[PDB]
Each structure stands twice: as C-alpha cells, then as structure tokens.
Design a protein around this nucleic acid. Structure first.
Ligand SMILES: Nc1ncnc2c1ncn2[C@@H]1O[C@H](COP(=O)(O)OP(=O)(O)NP(=O)(O)O)[C@@H](O)[C@H]1O
Ligand SMILES: [Zn+2]
Length: 682
RNA sequence: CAAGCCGAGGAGAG
RNA sequence: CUCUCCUCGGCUUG
C-alpha cells in the first residue's frame, strides 16, 4: 500500500487517539487511508501488548464484500485476520464468536445493533463496545435522527458520560468517521448549518473535521471536477393528446359531482383523489372511490406525459384496463353501472388515443435535448464512452432503456445501454435483485453497456467505473446527491448536466443546493478554527441534548398501541362493501404473517396467475368477486394457506362504526393469535 | 427466484 | 402533520 502526501496530513492526528471525522473529496483514496490507519492501529496495539480489534461499519450490503475484496484483504492478508459480514451470508449466526477471532471485521451495521440489544435484552451472548478498540465508519452524513448508526453512538456517548461522571473508567474505543461531505441538514442560515455540523460531531464524539488544505495542488492535479451545465426547454403545444385526456377526466368528475379546487396533471389533485377514495371507503359509497382509483391513474399518465412519450402513458393505461377486464372475466367465469360507464368511456377512445399518441410532430422537448447532449459526447469520445443517466422513477428507466434500444441512432454510435433500479419490494413495480445489480456493474466495468439509466441507487455506495457524461433528468434531491454525482465524472472532458422543463422549479433547487455546497465549507472553516474549549463546551451540550432527546422519545413511544382486542372487528372488502372475515378466524405464523384458514373465506376468492413469475406460478395473487385484489398465496408446512393484506380491506368496529384504513398491520392496536393446527385438525 | 413483516433516511406537494 | 416518489437495512415462509 501507498501513503499519499495529502492523505498523510489528514490522517495524522488519528494515529494517536483523536477520534475524528474525515471529509475529503470523492475518489481521493478514502478507503486506502482507512486501511493505513487500520494497520497502524493494530501494529501499535500489538507493540503495547494490548488487544486490538477494528470494526468497519457500512450502510449497504455490497460495500462490505466490496471492501473485503479490493482494499482490506489484499493488503492485510499477511499480518492479520479479516472477514466480511452482511445479511447475505451465514456468519451472522455466531457474531459474538467471530469477534473472538478476526481482528479486522467488516460489517453491515444493524448486525451490530441487534447483537447489542440481544446482550441487553435477552440472555444471549451478545457483545459490548468494550470488546473493540476502533470503529471505522463510512458515509458519516447518515448520522441523524434515529437512523442506524446512531443508536450505536448514543450508547457510546451514554457510556462516555458514565466515564466522565466517574472521573469526578472503561477504556472506550476510538472512532473514525469517513465521508465526502457531511452536508448541511436543511438550514436557511450559515449559523444553523454550523449547528448541524456540530450536531454530527457530537454524534461522533469528534475532535475535528480535517479537510485537506495544505497539499491542495496535488489534489487538483490528481483529482478534478466536471463542468456544470444546464439544458432547458419549454412546451406549449400539447397538441392532440393532453386535452384528449382532460376531456375524459372532466366527464368522469361531472359524473361524480366532485369539485377538486385544483388542476389536472399535478400532485395536489392526486392527494385529493387519495383522501376522497379513503373517505368513500370509510363510508362505503362506491361511484366515487372507483372513479378516484381511475383518476389517479389518469393523473399519473399525464405526469409522465410531461416527461415521457404519450405511448408510454397509453401503455400504462392499457396494462391497467387489460388487467381489470381479465379480472372481471376470471370472476364471471355483475357489471355495475360504474365500471360499465368507465369502460365504455375508455375503450371507445382507445383506438383514438393510440392514433393521437403516435405523432412525431410533437413528441417532447427534453428527450430531444438529451438526444443532442448524448450524441455530442458519444461522437466526441469514440469507444471510451461511459455514460450515466439519472431520473426519478423506475418506469421512466424502463421507458428510456426501451427507446434507446428502439431508435437507431443511439445503436449506431455504439450507445449500448441498460437500466437500473433498487430492490425495494413496493411501489407497484417489480424491483430488481442484487445479483442483477452486481452483474450490470461488472458489465459496465467490462464495457458491455456504455450507459446506465438509474434512480437514486447510483448516487452512493456501489462502485461504478469513472464516467464522462453524467446527466440529470428531472431530479434534484439535495446537495449530497448533487456532489456525489458530481464526483463520478473523471476522464477529462467530463460534465454534469441538468435537464428540466421551464415551468417547474428545478433550476431553483439546483442553485439552492449549489449555495448549500458553498455554505457548508464556510461553516467547516468556522468550526475548525473554533477554540477547543468552546468547541468542547458546545459538543458536550449537544451530546447531552441528544441523549435527553432520546429518553423523552422512549417515554412517549413505549407501546402507543397496546389494547389487544381479539375479535372486536369485521374486515370488509374495500371495493364492494362486503363482509370477508372476522378477527377470530385469522391467525399468524412466525408472529409475522397474517392468514386465515376457514373454508368460508376459502370459497370467496379467485386466483389469477402471476405475471411476475412468467418473466410455473408459486405465489398466486388473490382477487375478490368484485375484482379488488386482496392478498397472496402462501406455503407454510405445505399448506397452501392464503395470506392477505390490510391495505385492500376496511375495518368495521362493532360499537359505533368509525371505519378506518391502516395501510399496514402494526398500526392497529389489537393483537391476533398465533397459528396452531389444533383447529381444522384432530 | 418468489411472497410477505418491521424499521430508517432523502425529496417533492399539501 | 399527512400523501406521493426514491433508496436502504434487518427478518421470516417457500
Ligand atoms: N494512496 C493511494 N495510492 C495509490 N493508489 C491509490 C491510493 N488511493 C487510491 N488509489 C487508487 O484509486 C482507486 C481506488 O480509490 P478511490 O478511487 O478513492 O476509491 P474510493 O475510496 O471509493 N474513493 P470514493 O469513491 O470517494 O469513496 C484505485 O485505482 C487505487 O489504485
Ligand atoms: Zn369485492
């Protein structure tokens, strides 16, 4: 391993105690300086006949294996014992034991917290911090309100104050936080920015920050920025299509007699639709809820029209209504006035909308703008042409990847592309899998795919190859994502683009984040130069406040919903105001999943085979006689006992009918019994 | 590989 | 404070 000049000075105080933060720019060899500090710490503790164990904490899964392979092991294999843990191994099981070996640990975080609370909650073996001598951390800036990793530090600080009260002593470990930039936490003033920085430092018990200042030219030579750049467009033609939908929506409303006091093709209208649907369901009146459920889809279509072709929205709707018709046919294998009206309204115009949509006279501006942007680069760079795109949603990524596959020009210049999204199981999309992710990464590094379409998945963690033409298509989250994307584009003649519309404040937000970036550095300078006694005073104050801010939160959130009422309810279908179950019939398996195993509920529903699995069905999706999907099948002990949700059902209390929607099971107070085969058997 | 439970953070709009 | 979008982590059934 090698020791750079400017990494030296930033590392220097850490080498003799002095828990600190380190914020350097991106790509400056953050991991490597980490590694060096490790080796020093361990060699030191050996030379003093003192036990030395380091643990690394990360926030994602992949970074653990990542760093295990590339940085720590290749250099420290010979002197020491290393290991890499995560939720994707089998070494989680005896975590207290691996500590008894493996002086170097890498780990996903919540592993640790789980073990601590097992030591402090059950009679399990567990572990305490005393068994360490260092904690190295990545991505400092997640240390905020009740994240994971702040439990850890709140406990560290609790024990530190125990030590301090003792002094007026357990040897606490050293801490070393590493980041790119800690970031201003939503503050409108330089002073509150400062306050936030100090809040971080108190949550890390730091002594400084140690930005690089002295050996700065070596950085500028070795490391450089891209060039910021904007591209803007405007649209007032909306020629055939938009109005063609607004007509429909207006017709539905004037069938429903509901006044939005709002506009078509925005987000407040959506919120209204939601609460209206919820109200209609808590009351039970159809004709309003179901129309709302459709209007939401129409609004979504319009929103994506603002960014994406008409064809994609038409397809979105086609999928929706095709599904609904298939549902009604599987059930009927009756036709209420509502659904009949809605379908008759839609399908008559289906062919029209298909014609209107395919119309290259007025496709979209931003797509053309990025056409120009992209072609410029891939003509300039010629086979060293790595690319990245960022957007907001998943569907957008699929659409763009599809298009770039379709249009010939992109394929002509060698614009090989692939999409990328996150693995969360929610949000009406089939997510990806970690394997797919890693493979795409390796293809990019290989060069199979020249450019990637991504959500916010890329602006952290996983290690993409350096790039040229990072852009930004309808997304401005905050300064952190801004800088982290800004730190990708090496390979000179790099850029950082933003593509937006005119009448949607985004460039606004871009500038705000730019100012925030310029602000935080000022604050850093304010604090680095702060006097040590004053600094100490303030961090002590903040640590106290943080710990007291814990206790209170503890005193008001013990249970907050504890009234266990077994069968005091009735679950109805939310589309059709129809009984489905009572609370007694339901049971739980593994104290997590809810399920019912009475033949009454058995006969009520229908199974529609899966589309996720065709991409032999195993987990069937349940539907009603109305058509409302309810749940999913399940295989427990071979019993195909069908699970369900509480997002599609409505509750009715027996007393006075405040019917409520809950969106998940933990929110409600009442408890359900565990499953046992004594019922239905013996 | 599919299904689901819980928790956390960020952003928008209200 | 609520809704939506986005990401992440831990954990179970198969
Ligand atoms: N001290 C060093 N000496 C030699 N090469 C280094 C050093 N630090 C980093 N590198 C090289 O830089 C690459 C890895 O470092 P880097 O690009 O900073 O990844 P990183 O630690 O993830 N930076 P970041 O993305 O900001 O977290 C490899 O090509 C290394 O060879
Ligand atoms: Zn129904």
């Amino acid at each position: 391993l090698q020791l750079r000049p400017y990494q030296m000075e930033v590392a220097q105080p850490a080498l003799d105690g002095k828990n600190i933060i380190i914020c350097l720019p991106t790509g400056s060899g953050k991991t490597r300086v980490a590694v060096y500090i490790t080796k020093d710490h361990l060699d030191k503790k050996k030379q003093a006949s003192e036990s030395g164990k380091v643990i690394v904490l990360v926030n994602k899964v992949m970074l653990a294996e990542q760093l295990f392979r590339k940085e720590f092991n290749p250099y420290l294999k010979k002197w020491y014992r290393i290991i890499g843990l995560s939720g994707d191994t089998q070494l989680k099981i005896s975590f207290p034991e691996v500590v008894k070996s493996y002086d170097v640990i890498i780990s996903t975080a919540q592993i640790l917290e789980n073990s601590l609370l097992n030591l402090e909650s059950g009679d399990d073996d567990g572990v305490q911090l005393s068994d360490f001598s260092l904690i190295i951390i990545d991505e400092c800036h997640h240390t905020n309100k009740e994240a994971v990793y702040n439990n850890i530090m709140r406990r560290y600080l609790k024990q530190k104050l125990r030590n301090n009260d003792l002094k007026k002593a357990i040897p606490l470990p050293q801490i070393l936080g590493l980041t790119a930039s800690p970031g201003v936490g939503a503050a409108k003033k330089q002073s509150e920015a400062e306050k936030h920085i100090l809040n971080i430092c108190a949550n890390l018990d730091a002594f400084t920050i140690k930005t690089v200042k002295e050996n700065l030219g070596q950085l500028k030579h070795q490391i450089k920025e891209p060039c910021k750049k904007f591209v803007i467009a405007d649209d007032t033609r909306e020629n055939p299509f938009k109005e063609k939908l607004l007509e429909i929506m207006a017709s539905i409303q004037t069938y429903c007699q509901k006044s939005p006091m709002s506009d078509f093709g925005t987000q407040h209208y959506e919120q209204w639709a939601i609460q209206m649907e919820k109200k209609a369901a808590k009351d039970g009146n159809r004709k309003d809820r179901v129309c709302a459920e459709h209007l939401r889809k129409y609004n979504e279509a319009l929103q994506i029209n603002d960014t994406i072709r008409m064809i994609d929205a038409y397809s979105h709707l086609e999928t929706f209504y095709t599904d609904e018709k298939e549902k009604k046919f599987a059930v009927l294998n009756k036709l209420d006035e509502t659904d009949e009206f809605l379908m008759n309204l839609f399908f008559d115009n289906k062919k029209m909308l298909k014609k209107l949509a395919e119309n290259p006279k007025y496709e979209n501006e931003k797509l053309i703008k990025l056409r120009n942007t992209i072609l410029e680069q891939f003509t300039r760079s010629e086979e060293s042409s790595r690319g990245i795109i960022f957007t907001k949603t998943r569907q957008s990524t699929y659409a763009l990847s599809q298009w770039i596959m379709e249009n010939a020009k992109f394929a002509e210049v060698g614009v090989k592309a692939h999409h990328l999204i996150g693995a969360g199981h929610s949000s009406e999309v089939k997510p990806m899998t970690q394997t797919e992710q890693k493979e795409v990464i390796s293809k990019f590094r290989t060069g199979e795919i020249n450019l990637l379409i991504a959500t916010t998945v890329a602006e952290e963690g996983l290690d993409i190859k350096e790039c040229n033409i990072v852009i930004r298509y309808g997304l401005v989250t905050n300064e952190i994502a801004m800088v982290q994307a800004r730190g990708r584009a090496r390979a000179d003649e790099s850029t950082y683009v933003l593509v937006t519309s005119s009448g949607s404040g985004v460039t606004e937000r871009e500038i705000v984040n730019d100012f925030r970036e310029k602000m935080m550095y000022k604050a850093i300078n304010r604090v680095q130069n702060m006097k040590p006694e004053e600094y100490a005073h303030k961090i002590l104050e903040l640590q106290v406040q943080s710990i007291l801010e814990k206790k209170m939160k503890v005193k008001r959130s013990i249970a907050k919903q504890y009234n266990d009422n077994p069968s005091l309810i009735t679950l109805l279908c939310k589309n059709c105001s129809m009984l489905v179950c009572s609370g007694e019939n339901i049971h739980v398996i593994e104290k997590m999943h809810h399920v019912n195993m009475t033949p009454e509920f058995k006969g009520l529903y229908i199974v529609r085979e899966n589309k996720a699995l065709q991409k032999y069905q195993t987990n069937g999706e349940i539907i009603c006689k109305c058509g409302q999907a309810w749940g999913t099948m399940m295989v427990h002990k071979g019993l195909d006992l069908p699970c369900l949700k509480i997002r599609n059902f409505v509750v009715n209390f027996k007393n006075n009918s405040p019917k409520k929607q809950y969106k998940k099971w933990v929110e409600l107070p009442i408890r359900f019994p565990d499953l046992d085969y004594s019922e239905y058997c013996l």
